[PDB]
Design a protein around this ligand. Structure first.
Ligand SMILES: CCc1nc(Nc2ccc(S(N)(=O)=O)cc2)nc2nc[nH]c12
Ligand SMILES: [Cl-]
Ligand SMILES: [Cl-]
Ligand SMILES: [Cl-]
Length: 252
């Protein structure tokens, strides 16, 4: 509940909200992270908004969602610390980077693990009712478990619905693009312009994922990338696919 209860080990990274630091809890030595934000220049209404936000976030307990632990306030440094579980495997964007640089395609078993566990995380989030579902916000623990994490760049994953005129099947489309990039080490739609990217997305054409991946996996990813949302599989229909087995799920 107090900053002195933890010791900063080191800065993991910055960007987006604020600064992300790997920390250790003094009482038991548990390894966590915290995101330090600066609320001082936010309105009272803005801090109220974010308070209800992180309350809803504290109302989320799922093995495939980054676990929230605590919140700490420091009026001296006008800093709000949000304490969360540390995922030692890193993010998925780094895994895709490593595969691209090493010219090493990822195992199909790993793609199935990500598909299964991210589908379960999305199911949970749909039960508790424009996103940022992308490799940089998906993390891995030490036991192959996948955890869902919380402008100049091109929106490579933006559905045609969210581009013409958002629903759960849009989440399915974003998952499809993420799994595609895991298999092919590149997004399904490439462009230097945002207009060209919009055109390519609307036409809905892409290369098959590399041939080392099963026809069943390509089939389900292609179904997720259908132009019509009502043709994309629901969470339930994804989980019914014969590709998805027990060992693809989380394990403590
Ligand atoms: C930065 C956001 C974040 N990161 C991590 N872990 C982690 C990240 C990168 C690497 S890396 N590129 O050195 O291999 C290793 C571990 N856990 C987290 N939990 C909540 N937000 C987390
Ligand atoms: Cl690592
Ligand atoms: Cl390659
Ligand atoms: Cl190919």
């Amino acid at each position: 509940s107090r900053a002195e209860d933890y010791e900063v080990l080191y800065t993991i990274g910055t960007g987006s909200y604020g600064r992300c630091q790997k920390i250790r809890r003094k009482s038991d030595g548990k390894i966590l992270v915290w995101k330090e934000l600066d609320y001082g220049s936010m309105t009272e209404a803005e801090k109220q908004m974010l308070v209800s936000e992180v309350n809803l976030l504290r109302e989320l307990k799922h093995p495939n969602i980054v676990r929230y632990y605590d919140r700490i306030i420091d009026r001296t440094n006008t800093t709000l610390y949000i304490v969360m579980e540390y995922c030692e495997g890193g993010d998925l964007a780094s895994v895709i980077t490593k595969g691209t640089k090493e010219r090493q395609y990822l195992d199909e078993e790993f793609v199935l693990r990500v598909m299964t566990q991210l589908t379960l995380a999305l199911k949970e989030c749909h039960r508790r009712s424009h996103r940022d579902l992308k490799p940089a916000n998906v993390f891995l623990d030490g036991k192959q478990n996948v955890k869902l994490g919380d402008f100049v760049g091109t929106p490579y994953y933006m559905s045609p619905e969210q581009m013409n005129r958002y629903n759960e099947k849009s989440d399915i489309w974003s998952l499809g693009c993420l799994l595609y990039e895991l298999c092919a080490l590149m997004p399904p739609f490439t462009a230097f312009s945002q207009k060209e990217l919009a055109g390519k997305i609307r036409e809905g054409k892409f290369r098959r994922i590399p041939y080392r991946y099963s026809d069943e996996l390509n089939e389900i990813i292609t179904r997720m990338l259908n132009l019509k949302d009502y043709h994309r599989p629901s969470v339930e229909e994804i989980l019914e696919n014969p590709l998805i087995l027990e060992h693809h799920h989380h394990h403590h």
